[PDB]
Design a protein around this motif. Structure first.
Motif, mmCIF file in Angstrom:
data_model
loop_
_atom_site.group_PDB
_atom_site.id
_atom_site.type_symbol
_atom_site.label_atom_id
_atom_site.label_comp_id
_atom_site.label_asym_id
_atom_site.label_seq_id
_atom_site.Cartn_x
_atom_site.Cartn_y
_atom_site.Cartn_z
ATOM 1 N N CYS A 1 -11.816 4.202 3.147
ATOM 2 C CA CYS A 1 -11.025 3.788 4.069
ATOM 3 C C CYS A 1 -9.572 3.266 3.495
ATOM 4 O O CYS A 1 -9.688 3.311 2.350
ATOM 5 N N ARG A 2 -8.528 3.263 4.244
ATOM 6 C CA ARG A 2 -7.377 2.908 3.750
ATOM 7 C C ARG A 2 -6.988 1.586 4.533
ATOM 8 O O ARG A 2 -7.463 1.446 5.645
ATOM 9 N N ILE A 3 -6.149 0.587 4.017
ATOM 10 C CA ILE A 3 -5.730 -0.406 4.672
ATOM 11 C C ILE A 3 -4.238 -0.539 4.735
ATOM 12 O O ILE A 3 -3.360 0.004 3.914
ATOM 13 N N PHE B 1 -7.946 -1.698 9.037
ATOM 14 C CA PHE B 1 -8.694 -0.817 8.468
ATOM 15 C C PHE B 1 -8.595 0.606 9.152
ATOM 16 O O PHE B 1 -8.495 0.682 10.405
ATOM 17 N N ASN C 1 -9.691 -3.723 13.308
ATOM 18 C CA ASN C 1 -9.101 -5.213 12.524
ATOM 19 C C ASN C 1 -10.369 -5.772 11.868
ATOM 20 O O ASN C 1 -11.379 -6.341 12.893
ATOM 21 N N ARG D 1 -13.985 -5.256 2.029
ATOM 22 C CA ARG D 1 -12.575 -5.152 1.273
ATOM 23 C C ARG D 1 -13.153 -6.013 0.097
ATOM 24 O O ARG D 1 -13.031 -7.079 -0.117
ATOM 25 N N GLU E 1 -7.333 -7.754 8.113
ATOM 26 C CA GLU E 1 -6.904 -6.610 7.589
ATOM 27 C C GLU E 1 -7.197 -5.430 8.664
ATOM 28 O O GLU E 1 -8.122 -5.516 9.465
ATOM 29 N N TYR F 1 0.743 -0.949 -0.235
ATOM 30 C CA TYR F 1 0.050 -0.054 0.114
ATOM 31 C C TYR F 1 0.933 1.400 0.185
ATOM 32 O O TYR F 1 1.846 1.097 0.177
ATOM 33 N N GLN G 1 -0.537 -2.575 6.257
ATOM 34 C CA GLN G 1 -0.009 -3.657 6.371
ATOM 35 C C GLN G 1 1.113 -3.706 7.284
ATOM 36 O O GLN G 1 1.517 -4.650 8.163
#
Ligand SMILES: *[C@@H]1O[C@H](CO)[C@@H](O[C@@H]2O[C@H](CO)[C@@H](O[C@@H]3O[C@H](CO)[C@@H](O)[C@H](O)[C@@H]3O)[C@H](O)[C@H]2NC(C)=O)[C@H](O)[C@H]1NC(C)=O
Ligand SMILES: *[C@@H]1O[C@H](CO)[C@@H](O[C@@H]2O[C@H](CO)[C@@H](O)[C@H](O)[C@H]2NC(C)=O)[C@H](O)[C@H]1NC(C)=O
Ligand SMILES: *[C@@H]1O[C@H](CO)[C@@H](O[C@@H]2O[C@H](CO)[C@@H](O)[C@H](O)[C@H]2NC(C)=O)[C@H](O)[C@H]1NC(C)=O
Ligand SMILES: *[C@@H]1O[C@H](CO)[C@@H](O[C@@H]2O[C@H](CO)[C@@H](O)[C@H](O)[C@H]2NC(C)=O)[C@H](O)[C@H]1NC(C)=O
Ligand SMILES: *[C@@H]1O[C@H](CO)[C@@H](O[C@@H]2O[C@H](CO)[C@@H](O)[C@H](O)[C@H]2NC(C)=O)[C@H](O)[C@H]1NC(C)=O
Ligand SMILES: *[C@@H]1O[C@H](CO)[C@@H](O)[C@H](O)[C@H]1NC(C)=O
Ligand SMILES: *[C@@H]1O[C@H](CO)[C@@H](O)[C@H](O)[C@H]1NC(C)=O
Ligand SMILES: *[C@@H]1O[C@H](CO)[C@@H](O)[C@H](O)[C@H]1NC(C)=O
Ligand SMILES: *[C@@H]1O[C@H](CO)[C@@H](O)[C@H](O)[C@H]1NC(C)=O
Ligand SMILES: *[C@@H]1O[C@H](CO)[C@@H](O)[C@H](O)[C@H]1NC(C)=O
Ligand SMILES: *[C@@H]1O[C@H](CO)[C@@H](O)[C@H](O)[C@H]1NC(C)=O
Ligand SMILES: *[C@@H]1O[C@H](CO)[C@@H](O)[C@H](O)[C@H]1NC(C)=O
Ligand SMILES: *[C@@H]1O[C@H](CO)[C@@H](O)[C@H](O)[C@H]1NC(C)=O
Ligand SMILES: *[C@@H]1O[C@H](CO)[C@@H](O)[C@H](O)[C@H]1NC(C)=O
Ligand SMILES: *[C@@H]1O[C@H](CO)[C@@H](O)[C@H](O)[C@H]1NC(C)=O
Ligand SMILES: *[C@@H]1O[C@H](CO)[C@@H](O)[C@H](O)[C@H]1NC(C)=O
Ligand SMILES: *[C@@H]1O[C@H](CO)[C@@H](O)[C@H](O)[C@H]1NC(C)=O
Ligand SMILES: *[C@@H]1O[C@H](CO)[C@@H](O)[C@H](O)[C@H]1NC(C)=O
Ligand SMILES: *[C@@H]1O[C@H](CO)[C@@H](O)[C@H](O)[C@H]1NC(C)=O
Ligand SMILES: *[C@@H]1O[C@H](CO)[C@@H](O)[C@H](O)[C@H]1NC(C)=O
Ligand SMILES: *[C@@H]1O[C@H](CO)[C@@H](O)[C@H](O)[C@H]1NC(C)=O
Ligand SMILES: *[C@@H]1O[C@H](CO)[C@@H](O)[C@H](O)[C@H]1NC(C)=O
Ligand SMILES: *[C@@H]1O[C@H](CO)[C@@H](O)[C@H](O)[C@H]1NC(C)=O
Ligand SMILES: *[C@@H]1O[C@H](CO)[C@@H](O)[C@H](O)[C@H]1NC(C)=O
Lengths: 436, 98, 119, 122, 124, 122, 123
Positions: A351-353, A330, A324, A246, A328, A128, A355
């Motif tokens: 939203c953004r994810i 968020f 969570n 997602r 993932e 990302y 890692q």
């Protein structure tokens, strides 16, 4: 004449700070918890009024310590991704990309280690745009200059499991059964329980997710409602339904990096790449905010304009709603929900994810969330808010409330506010007419 | 709110003048001493409580809707601007001229 | 001994921005809130805002909202205050004050910096 | 009722159910559970030893030979046993509690000596 | 008021056995100790029997210590006295009384508050 | 006199200070401290069980029915209780303590059987 | 015979050796394991001693009580119970009635303690 008579076993207790233990029916609720008796007991105490204070309750600190310790232990027998801090050669992903996730997913190739030290391999992974900073198209992971990174074990689930906190023998847990209890002061309806209810260790900011709803009406709980420096916990009477998704059809590849160690990496997105939006029921959310305003007016006045605005700034963990979902992490943009002025369909949040997650706002211990294959659905109940009040007002007839949080203890105060732990002192004396 | 303070208090050593914070809500009233050329300091933690290391000469009190700071005697060293505060709201400053 | 050391005085023109630093020493930076306060040019003290460094959270006085950005660098325990779109009313002594646990006690008050706005 | 159920009842009513409270006095969590268990055992044994040195071992309602001093509390039996709860009483006599304990210990010592002397009167 | 209503009766063989019963009202039954006191026909009073609040404790004079049984049923608010064997000296009016002992928790009594009307026991 | 204050004192004087010396009988570092605390608890419980099986539970000064045998110490009561300390006495009869304790257990067993028969004689 | 020696003996004979089986109740992965085992043994011993205490049997190995025996539990005569039976067969026979007996013993001791307290009230 009266004489001293000694009694052992009197129903006497005093406030005390002790260690409670876990009971349960995975990162949380591991095999070290004892099994829970399926028949709970609650011994209502008639004629007993006890003073409670949810803001100095040491079992919130004990809960926090236990969660930190379980989190740290779960990452110990797992693969540490020290070799992954290498120079990345990244290009943008343009295959079927939509106009919203523009420049968010990056295809990055790098020279990874393999089973044998002598050889290197050229491999690629999607990352990302929040987990890549630009040295000097050369990129590195954001953690490489601040933290060592541990990969979470692929077989450990991040789903919360209810944990019961039970007092050791000689101690008791007192539950306040009142319906208008505001977190402090006398509680005229007290019961003693063996253990607390099932508390899910849900990790979130901005909005509170799954939990126990208020029984009669929306409750506003603060240590000092007029003090800006304190957080306001809003407990809903009715849940607000939130559906986060997602939609990307993902896949997981296993890159061997050493003698039995493996890295799990994103391979490609089968189909269109779309934004992982989340939908909150609009009419229910508005009705809920109306209830929240109606309750706040009892503390600030019935002639005060109540305004909602989005977070004033800070780290991504506190300016967006972190949670969570399916494994993932968020970070949803809730600036579409705190936008209103109150005078005395559905809402879609982008939203953004991420890692690369540095949990609990620590420095030096980063974790890599392995990607989950397939689309991801979460349907959950919003049960409360963490609000702050803007200070320094010059317009005296209006108040502006913004979401806050980020200190995870203030999440668990929304669950442990009814419980206090006391020490039993069964030995005492009293006058009687008997003489030895 | 809008805290109101007495702009100028005058006297001499041993007068033991008292400064009043008019308009404060109950509890968590703090007092600050500001010396021009130096950053200020916290004289009263809450109503009356004082930081360790500060002279006992300063003592706070409350009168229901009014707060006050009592100086046991205006020693020559102690001249400055004193600000009372409830949350972020500051007073107008009391010029404690000897 | 806890100390808070600030940058020197600065003179800026109207429309420019100013970033005031405050380096903390002698205590754990993450656990106590920072509060930034004005002296104003010969008036009493005026509070502008606070920042919670553990999460980075900020709370700005209504009159300064949209103009002031508060941040920090936790690796060397320094807080920053950025003022955008300066005007002639903003010339003042500026201070950083630690918080006494939680609440509004401003305790340790730093040394201060003089921001001057003129043409 | 069950454990601590009589807490809101009167002292002369809560004293009828003393065994209910008495029976309830007996890695992240490995060492914490072990410390909690050792703490519970230590507190129980300290209470049992304290009862022992007073001559009240094995009894829950133990009469003693220490007279009640009206300075500790001058309320009569109809206000203590019929119109009061144990928690209120604990607050009432807390300051003097250690004094009472000292007298109890001293009383047992004298009664331990005297009984020994009787057993020596052939 | 407090009323103690004996029933019993009086026509008993010199070597016979009888039972008296006594009902009480106007107050909390389970919190007072009770007693039986007898008065020979034209002579003074004699205490006969004492029972605690809970019915577990019995006390007797020596002259009836092996013959009389005193019992109490708190649920039905009754007192009873079972006499066996008897003797010629037992001719008397028997009265219930409330008092004569108290538990350690409550104040001391050692006296009788309310006396019932009684019943006459005559041994032929 | 505090804890062990009578250690050099006369046995007849030290025998009045039993209570002071009875009240004081009750990750790696956590394990070490827990081992020490559990060891203290086990030693206390072994001493209390040993008192219990002798019929001396709840007492500090317990008379028994076992006669004193001159072979253990042919010393008159004055030489023991007026002139010696408990340390000197403990050294003097250490050889025989494992004998004495055994005899005590036997006497209590007989006593218990005796008590049992009396409670049935009726 | 020492520990558990009177296991196959009759309860009459076995009742004279109670001290022998009474003294055998008291004495980082292995550190935590052994401390858990020792604390478990201590807690079981103290639960038994507390249970004896609330029955009025503290400090005794053979304790007579004031609870009558109920034929329903077992209608056997003492010439079979004590002279022709072991403790294992007995304990198996009155396993289903143990909790009732424990409750009756607890209530009997509570009544006796109240009775003793009142007997000292009397002047
Ligand atoms: C709040 O509660 C809701 C409802 O319990 C949570 O939704 C649940 O989330 C878990 C993952 O955290 C889902 O597990 C997955 O289930 C599917 C079922 O096919 C399986 O394929 C996956 O391997 C995994 O087991 C669970 O099904 C889901 N429940 C529902 C009814 O949708 C929600 O996640 C909770 N909140 C937070 C913040 O976690
Ligand atoms: C959340 O709301 C959005 C917006 O209404 C929904 O978007 C629709 O998605 C379907 C496919 O599932 C498209 O065919 C529609 O055109 C979309 N409508 C729009 C953009 O207005 C979305 O499905 C909702 N989803 C949840 C439950 O995740
Ligand atoms: C989130 O998804 C749930 C299902 O997971 C949706 O639930 C449906 O809601 C409609 C009314 O809106 C009901 O008629 C259906 O019976 C529900 N279906 C199921 C399977 O429960 C819900 O509408 C979605 N919520 C939001 C806020 O979009
Ligand atoms: C809160 O909402 C404001 C708008 O009310 C957002 O402000 C925008 O921020 C973006 C960058 O993030 C700028 O490009 C826009 O110019 C801003 N607009 C205005 C009107 O100021 C702000 O980002 C939101 N804050 C959050 C989500 O933390
Ligand atoms: C969260 O959402 C708000 C509004 O939905 C975003 O504000 C917009 O930001 C874009 C980006 O530059 C601007 O072009 C728009 O003008 C803004 N809209 C409004 C109404 O102010 C905000 O940027 C989002 N938050 C983040 C952190 O990106
Ligand atoms: C990816 O797109 C963004 C869009 O702003 C651009 O800044 C960036 O340089 C692009 N990267 C490459 C390697 O083309
Ligand atoms: C892999 O290493 C070679 C040299 O060994 C280098 O030329 C190449 O750029 C590296 N791979 C990437 C993706 O940069
Ligand atoms: C680490 O790198 C980031 C790049 O995002 C930079 O902003 C930050 O100051 C660096 N911190 C340290 C401690 O080197
Ligand atoms: C919270 O409730 C308690 C008990 O009713 C009361 O004493 C206290 O003042 C309440 N606080 C507020 C802010 O209403
Ligand atoms: C969400 O709300 C529903 C309402 O029926 C409830 O049954 C369910 O348990 C809630 N889910 C969670 C995770 O709390
Ligand atoms: C990333 O680059 C590799 C290079 O071989 C390519 O095969 C792959 O399809 C790319 N991934 C995506 C998601 O476009
Ligand atoms: C919906 O939100 C708006 C925001 O201003 C509010 O004014 C309105 O009353 C709300 N409607 C309902 C039905 O709550
Ligand atoms: C925010 O508020 C304005 C009114 O001030 C409203 O018109 C607009 O739709 C809102 N923007 C959102 C929810 O993004
Ligand atoms: C994702 O795509 C794959 C194609 O490789 C398909 O087999 C799978 O069923 C899809 N999963 C979902 C959840 O759509
Ligand atoms: C703030 O809260 C505390 C604890 O809940 C309370 O004791 C105190 O009086 C409150 N103070 C205010 C209103 O200043
Ligand atoms: C509580 O007090 C009431 C009288 O106010 C009394 O009737 C009741 O029995 C008491 N309840 C308990 C459980 O003691
Ligand atoms: C205990 O002492 C304090 C201070 O001397 C006193 O205020 C309080 O009333 C005392 N407690 C009692 C009499 O129960
Ligand atoms: C030590 O012995 C002397 C006599 O030799 C005596 O006076 C004194 O009290 C003794 N002290 C103690 C502590 O026994
Ligand atoms: C006293 O001790 C001696 C030596 O141990 C022993 O032989 C003797 O039998 C003992 N006395 C009696 C009366 O049994
Ligand atoms: C005890 O024996 C000693 C031996 O020295 C003697 O002096 C003393 O008088 C004796 N005491 C008596 C018989 O009480
Ligand atoms: C005790 O035994 C040891 C070893 O047999 C011997 O040296 C010592 O003298 C004995 N003590 C007595 C008092 O008999
Ligand atoms: C076993 O039983 C026999 C008779 O059947 C008896 O003589 C013997 O003593 C018993 N063994 C024990 C240890 O009781
Ligand atoms: C014996 O037990 C039976 C049923 O198990 C019961 O009905 C009877 O009343 C009991 N008798 C007693 C305890 O005397
Ligand atoms: C006990 O009962 C058995 C039959 O079950 C009989 O043989 C024996 O004689 C009985 N003993 C007594 C003492 O009644």
């Amino acid at each position: 004449n009266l004489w001293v008579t000694v009694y052992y076993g009197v129903p006497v207790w005093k406030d005390a700070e002790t260690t409670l233990f876990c009971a349960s029916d995975n990162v949380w609720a591991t095999h070290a918890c004892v099994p829970t008796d399926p028949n709970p007991q609650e011994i209502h105490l008639e004629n007993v009024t006890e003073e409670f204070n949810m803001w100095k309750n040491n079992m919130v600190e004990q809960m926090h310590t236990d969660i930190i310790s379980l989190w740290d232990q779960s990452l110990k027998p797992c693969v540490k991704l020290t070799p992954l801090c290498v120079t990345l050669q990244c290009t943008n992903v343009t295959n079927n990309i939509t106009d919203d996730m523009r420049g968010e997913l990056k295809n990055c190739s790098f020279n990874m280690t393999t089973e044998l030290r002598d050889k290197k391999q050229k491999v690629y992974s999607l990352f990302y745009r929040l987990d890549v900073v630009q040295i000097n198209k050369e990129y590195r992971l954001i953690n490489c200059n601040t933290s060592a990174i541990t990969q979470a074990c692929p077989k450990v689930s991040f789903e919360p499991i209810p944990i019961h906190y039970c007092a050791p023998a000689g101690f008791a847990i007192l539950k306040c059964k009142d319906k208008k209890f505001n977190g402090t002061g006398p509680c005229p309806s007290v019961s003693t329980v063996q253990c607390t209810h099932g508390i899910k260790p849900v990790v979130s900011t901005q909005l509170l997710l799954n939990g126990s709803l208020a029984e009669e009406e929306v409750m506003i709980r603060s240590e000092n409602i007029t003090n800006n420096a304190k957080n306001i916990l809003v407990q809903f009477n009715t849940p607000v339904q939130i559906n986060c998704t997602r939609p990307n059809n993902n896949t997981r590849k296993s890159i061997r990096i050493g003698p039995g160690q493996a890295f799990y990496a994103t391979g490609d997105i089968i189909g269109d790449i779309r934004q992982a939006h989340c939908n909150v029921s609009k009419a229910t959310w508005n009705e809920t905010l109306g209830k929240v305003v109606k309750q706040l007016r009892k503390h600030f006045g019935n002639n005060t304009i109540i305004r909602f605005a989005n977070s004033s700034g800070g780290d991504l963990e506190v300016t967006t709603h972190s949670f969570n979902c399916g494994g993932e992490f968020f970070y949803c943009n809730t600036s579409g929900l705190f936008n209103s002025t109150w005078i005395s369909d559905s809402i879609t949040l982008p939203c953004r994810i991420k890692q690369i997650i540095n949990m609990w706002q620590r420095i030096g211990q980063a974790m890599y969330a392995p990607p989950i294959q397939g689309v991801i659905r979460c349907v959950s109940n919003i049960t409360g808010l963490i609000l702050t009040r803007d200070g320094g007002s010059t317009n005296s007839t209006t108040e502006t409330f913004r979401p806050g949080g980020g200190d995870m203890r203030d999440n668990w105060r929304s669950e442990l506010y009814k419980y206090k732990v006391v020490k039993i002192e069964p030995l005492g004396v009293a006058p009687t007419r008997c003489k030895r | 709110s809008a805290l109101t303070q007495p702009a100028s208090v005058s006297g001499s050593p041993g007068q033991s003048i008292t400064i009043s914070c008019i308009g404060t809500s109950s509890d968590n009233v703090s007092w600050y001493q500001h010396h021009p050329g130096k950053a200020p300091k916290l004289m009263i933690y809450e109503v009356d409580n004082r930081p360790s290391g500060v002279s006992a000469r300063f003592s706070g009190s409350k009168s229901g809707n009014t707060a006050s700071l009592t100086i046991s005697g205006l020693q020559a060293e102690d001249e400055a601007d004193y600000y009372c505060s409830s949350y972020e709201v500051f007073g107008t400053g009391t010029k404690v001229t000897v | 001994q806890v100390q808070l050391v600030q940058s020197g005085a600065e003179v800026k023109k109207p429309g420019a921005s100013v970033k005031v630093s405050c380096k903390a020493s002698g205590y754990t930076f993450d656990d106590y809130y920072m509060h930034w306060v004005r002296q104003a040019p010969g008036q009493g003290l005026e509070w502008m805002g606070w920042m919670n460094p553990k999460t980075g959270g900020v709370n700005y006085a209504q009159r300064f909202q949209g103009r002031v950005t508060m941040t920090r660098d936790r690796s060397i325990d320094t807080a920053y205050m950025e003022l955008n779109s300066l005007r002639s009313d903003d010339t003042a002594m500026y201070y950083c004050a630690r918080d006494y646990g939680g609440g509004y006690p401003l305790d340790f008050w730093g040394q201060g910096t003089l921001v001057t706005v003129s043409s | 009722l069950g454990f601590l159920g009589a807490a809101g009842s009167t002292m002369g009513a809560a004293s009828m159910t003393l065994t209910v409270q008495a029976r309830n006095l007996l890695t992240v969590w490995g060492i914490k559970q072990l410390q909690a268990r050792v703490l519970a055992v230590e507190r129980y044994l300290r209470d049992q030893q304290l009862l022992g040195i007073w001559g009240c071992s094995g009894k829950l309602i133990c009469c003693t030979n220490v007279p009640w001093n009206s300075s500790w509390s001058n309320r009569n039996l109809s206000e203590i046993w019929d119109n009061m709860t144990w928690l209120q009483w604990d607050k009432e006599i807390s300051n003097y509690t250690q004094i009472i304990y000292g007298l109890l210990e001293e009383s047992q010592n004298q009664q331990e000596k005297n009984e020994q002397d009787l057993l020596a009167l052939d | 008021e407090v009323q103690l209503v004996e029933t019993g009766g009086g026509l008993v063989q010199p070597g016979g056995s009888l039972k008296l019963s006594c009902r009480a009202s106007g107050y909390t039954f389970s919190s007072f100790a009770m007693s039986w006191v007898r008065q020979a026909p034209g002579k003074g009073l004699e205490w006969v029997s004492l029972i605690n609040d809970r019915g577990g404790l019995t006390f007797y004079v020596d002259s009836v210590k092996g013959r009389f049984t005193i019992s109490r049923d708190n649920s039905k608010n009754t007192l009873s006295l079972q006499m066996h064997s008897l003797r010629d000296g037992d001719t008397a009016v028997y009265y219930c009384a409330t008092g004569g002992m108290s538990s350690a928790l409550q104040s001391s009594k050692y006296y009788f508050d309310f006396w019932g009307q009684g019943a006459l026991v005559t041994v032929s």
